[PDB]
RNA sequence: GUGAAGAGGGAAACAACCCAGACCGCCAGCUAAGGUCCCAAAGUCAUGGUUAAGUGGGAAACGCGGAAGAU
RNA sequence: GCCAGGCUGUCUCCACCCGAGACUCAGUGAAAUUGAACUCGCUGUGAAGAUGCAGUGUACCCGCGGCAAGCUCAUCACAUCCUGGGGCUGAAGUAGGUCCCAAGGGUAUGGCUGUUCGCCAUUUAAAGUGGUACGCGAGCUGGGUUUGUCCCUAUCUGCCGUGGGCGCUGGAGAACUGAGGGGGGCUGCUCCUAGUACGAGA
RNA sequence: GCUGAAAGCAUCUAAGCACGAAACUUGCCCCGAGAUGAGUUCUCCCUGACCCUUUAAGGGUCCUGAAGGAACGUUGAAGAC
């Protein structure tokens, strides 16, 4: 409700098309499409994107707010892109990257290889630091979550894969 | 690479240079002629119907004679199917040698075990039944020796069927 | 080989003369035991200060089998009787430093590296 | 009151549950209980409400829960 | 009247062989029972476990070979003993305590009882609870109780294997896709990771 | 578990929206079109005549007897038959 009443400013270089319920956004990174729920109406609103809940839907306000948030994220992605940083805390944790596959070794007897969805670029400024660039927040988040699931942040040393803007808690045995 | 039908001849132990003689069953695999090709368009699935051996003129029924003439193959004592590996089909009248099994190292042997007489209630249900002469496939058998110029195959262990019994050897799909 | 209530000979200076099997280990609900298998035996007759007293319960291993055992080359080495040497769960090193009769070449196991030294007769 | 000594219809079956006392016959119609999605004959019938859980299609005392039932 | 010893498939496990039956060929051929049988399973009711009443599913018609449901042999629910995962934990890890789910699989040998049950020794991952008239006497010893021939053609229902007739649409010989059904899916040890992560140390 | 409120925080889900237990099923192999829903593929044989009726999924007569099977013998590592 409150979040919905907030048109999102679309910067230059981003093209937005509203084909019925479908929203197609284009920018520097590439094409993006997203079928919007029918419970909210979206108009072009040049330089903005106004959302209006459809009459007859009790969930209209939350749907409109979520759609506005998703469109804002897509606009921010296409215009500049989304970047995520992941650190590998621990001795011997390598983050070799080649092609469209990220290879990791977090104490397993076998390497853990994760496939990179199209449109996602992986870079290694440092061997223990891995940076993902992607136009869509969902894809980069999913790949980062898949990488993190291989080795959970160990809650005794805070090892494994961690996000740059995430706080990792750790603890030690009380007395024994 | 693809299944071949052969005939059991005997089983022995092949003495290795290191004194590790292995039980080997001997299969004579004559060049099996691909009588027909079953494709998706006509037969609904990929496979080849093949034969081998020779049939007596009296033993060959005229329908079978025409079938072989269309296939362009010598009348073999039996016909069998072989499902392809979705790689490619074979041509009518093609004879398949044993070189395909020369580089497999793992095969499965399907055959009919030696027949046994009346299996009473105690032997079957512990009504009566019977044992033997049943087509079963023993899996995970590694070929020991292959001789293409002699059409000789030695396979580890034991296989169903007595001397002269027809059997099939297929790639060891199961591991 | 061994079965239920088997009669085993003795091939060590521990003083045992007649050893009788009681239980079979090396597999749940197992039937028999082999030469390279651990068996459960007790003693029936002991010297005045034999290391084993009647009713003892301790492990053992068969060194010679009346039934005979096979080899990869087809050898079926067999002996006139079943000979067994007692072993302990702790301090596996048997007390007997001398073994009567020859032994086969299957004693190359991890724990049987100290027995191959004994038995000078092959 | 019924059976005993009353047939028949309904309750899926069923003698004590509801309707209903068979002279015989005729390929007609109207009712009693019970039904009108079908099996199986009839409204997938009109209006005012409860039901989101197949509770209907089994359950007390007690603060919708209580609720666990037979190859 | 008791003890010690040698002594055999009584058994682990039974494997083969020798003579008569069990099966067929040619002939003799009686029985107990019989109202008539076009004699299925499951759920529910019924003078109370239904081949015959209400609902539902399967099954071409008729023969030959018997274990017998009418100690051996098993079947079904989890309301779980284990294999077990998952929440909580007074869970640092192994190891555990409570609870939710899981029946796919397993769920002993001896000494006292006739014993179900019950006590003790030895192992495993456990040596589970109940229904089937503690399931099973026209299957088996009667051990106590409760007529020690443990009686009554295995006549007929159900049961697997294999046959004779018939249709797949003119007939016939071959190779098969496959709707569906069946079987089992267990588990110990060592080696590199590694005396490694973690862990103040252990 | 990536963004994430409604309910300026938070949250497994309300919108976008991902892995995963030996628990279940395919996958391992056997029987299986009596599966009456009676299935798919290959090959082979028959290419005559006449008469009558209640005139049509009709009947009868002479000739013909194809492929295949069974009939019988040797018999089998096939079988009680």
Numbering used by the authors:
A (entry chain G): 1 to 176
B (entry chain D): 1 to 126, 161 to 209
C (entry chain K): 1 to 122
What does the paper say about this structure?
Notably, another precursor, C_(L29)-/(L22)-, displayed a complete core but lacked densities for uL22, uL29, bL23 (positioned adjacent to uL29), and bL32 (positioned adjacent to uL22), indicating that domain III can form and is at least partially stabilized even without uL22 and uL29. Furthermore, domain II helix H34, which serves as the foundation for positioning domain IV helices H64 to H67 during subsequent assembly, was consistently docked in all but two precursors (states d126_(L29)-/(L22)- & C_(L29)-/(L22)-). The absence of helix H34 was observed only in precursors that also lacked uL29 and bL23, indicating that these proteins are necessary for the proper formation of these critical regions in domains II and IV regions. Additional misorientation of domain IV regions was observed in nearly half of these cases, resulting in an overall frequency of 18.1% for the ~H61 states. In contrast, the absence of uL29 was observed only in the earliest precursor states, representing 5.1% of all precursors.
